[PDB]
Chains A and B, each alone.
Chain A
C-alpha cells in the first residue's frame, strides 16, 4: 500500500510544482512593482534635489 501511496504522491508533487511556480511568479511581479515604485519616487526626489541646488 505504501508503494501505491508513492505512485500518487508523485501526482500531488506534479501539481504542487505548478502552484509554487505561480506563487513565485506572483512574488516576482510584486517585487518588480515595488522596484518601479522606488525608481519613480527616486526620480521625484532627484528633481527636488536639483531645485534645492538651484536655490
Chain B
C-alpha cells in the first residue's frame, strides 16, 4: 500500500487471534491469605 510521503504515519493493528499475559497477580482469599497467580494469559481477537 502507498500513503503520503512524510506527513502520514501508519501503524498495523492485529485483527487475528493474539495472546498476552500478566505475571504475579495477587489474589486475596476469603480467609485473609494472599496467593499469587504466576501467570494469567488472555487470548483475544478484534473483528476487522
Contacts and interface: CB of A to CB of B under 8 A. Distances in A.
Interface in B19-48: 29, 31-33
B interface: dominant SS? loop
Using C-beta atoms within 8 Å of the partner chain, give the interface range for chain B: under 10
Contacts of A9: none
A16 B38 CA distance: 32
A interface: dominant SS? helix
B38 to A, nearest CB: 20
A6 to B, nearest CB: 10
A5 to B, nearest CB: 10
Contacts of A3: 31-32
A9 to B, nearest CB: 14
Interface of A: 1, 3-4, 7
